[PDB]
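Margin note: ligand = chloride ion.
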Amino acid sequence: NLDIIGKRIEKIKQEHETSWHYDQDHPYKTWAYHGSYETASSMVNGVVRLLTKPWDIIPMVTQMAMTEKVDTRTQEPKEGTKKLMKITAEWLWKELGKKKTPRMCTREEFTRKVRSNAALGAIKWKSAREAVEDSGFWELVDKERNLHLEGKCETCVYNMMIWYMWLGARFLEFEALGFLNEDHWFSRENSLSGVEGEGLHKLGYILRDVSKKEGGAMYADDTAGWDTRITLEDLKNEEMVTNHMEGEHKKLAEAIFKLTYQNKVVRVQRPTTVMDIISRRDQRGSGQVVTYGLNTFTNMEAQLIRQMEGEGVFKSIQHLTVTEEIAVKNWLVRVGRERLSRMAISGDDCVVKPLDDRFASALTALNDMGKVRKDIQQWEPSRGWNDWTQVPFCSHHFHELIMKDGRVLVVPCRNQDELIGRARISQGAGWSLRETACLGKSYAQMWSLMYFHRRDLRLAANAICSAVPSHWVPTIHATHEWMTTEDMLTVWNRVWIQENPWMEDKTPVESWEEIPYLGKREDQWCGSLIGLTSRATWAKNIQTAINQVRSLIGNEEYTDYMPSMKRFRR
Ligand SMILES: Cc1cc(Cn2nc(C)ccc2=O)on1
Ligand SMILES: Cc1cc(Cn2nc(C)ccc2=O)on1
Ligand SMILES: [Cl-]
Ligand SMILES: [Cl-]
Ligand SMILES: [Zn+2]
Ligand SMILES: [Zn+2]
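Resulting structure:
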């Protein structure tokens, strides 16, 4: 308690000593309140919207651009649950460690990241790019760092909104734990369940490979507030990664887990406006990228245990017998790798193809670990999927699509209203017409690469790339091959043919017309506006929309991509 968070509390209390009140009308029950002191909406991308006019009248698209569970308490698991988690976690860190070496990340790696611009989620210095160059920052980092070796913390404080800390705390986190992401610990090759750095063009092939295994249905249960259900027991099993570490690193990592993860401190703005200095031990509070890795780890653990319960490796979560402990360990050593290979896990998101459908009603460990399923009753058995093409994963489903030459594409898909609505939204303001156009172009090239099989998206993508100057540059499961000025057909051939391990025949495709679409009926099912008069007017009069946007941007060098499509080929 206060002996670990006090210093951080004391430092803040003094920076606002003038205005400090211990409010008695504070809304926190499960969060500890210490005191109080006085104290970037969604915009529309006009380039994308002018080139998607039929969607101006679709409420699912237009509503997307308009516009308390953290204060809950998860009970401590039973002793038999806690045992199962401890044994599985120890075995899983060993497996992940077999072919990887934990190691500290470096400023010269962190710096380069800030130069490339990433969601480091950091709050004297204007931007992050500036602070990185000023050694005064690195001096502050040194003081804190040397404090962490002391077993103490001063400035590592969360700001609720998404939990931003200041760039310095983010570095000390990245220094100790960045290896997890930087060195691909949750790669499919390394972790067997993971998909880190796979890409949306590989996920469908991965789910089809799981489907090939003998077993029951495919289960894809979402957790209700995954992060809020992260117990102190989960934070302590995650910390066992430090047992694979040495020297300074082991100390630095131990400090992040002890002082920032297992004993947090947060400043939340309450408009009644008084900045509450609230604390708590449990729930998920980290950088988005370390959160991804530890979420994947803990999810892999929970799902192996749910598989154990379904296969009758253990009878009761209340207590584990000495013989059961040996049986769990023997199960992991004998079949652990096989059972990891039956799953696709991305943070809190999973798909499991268990040995059989006993898994569907194996609920006691899952519920007692506090990973309560969403959109169902706690003890109602899971609904599985019989077809890998119906399974939801990372907000997508996957279609099997046969090319006119017999080669097989497995393509990602979601409701087209969600795709068009997202492309019409920008995260921030103050951007130029040029920067808005380059973001439109990023969406267009993503659509050409991932969603080429949707008739409306291939047409709108061609229209946007025709409307934006040819040479202008586009601006954690994913890898982003669409962020380039290279020709999109060349990138398509690299991604879907050359580099695709599921494609035996490497014959390049010579034109976009060789590249197939979904069934005309399969397109409407996933939200296409084909067979509507509106969409017909838009398609026919596409060159007029392209010319409207060219006139707004001005006299630049443009390319006509519309003749890459059959209907505009004269
Ligand atoms: C993805 C993503 C990035 C942004 C923020 N943004 N918005 C504009 C208008 C221009 C550039 C830019 O980066 O919005 N969505
Ligand atoms: C079902 C179904 C059949 C069609 C006919 N049609 N097909 C296309 C590809 C474009 C426009 C068009 O009217 O559209 N939806
Ligand atoms: Cl199904
Ligand atoms: Cl994007
Ligand atoms: Zn600290
Ligand atoms: Zn679909």
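The chain has three domains: 1-38+106-177+232-281, 184-228+293-393, 395-568.
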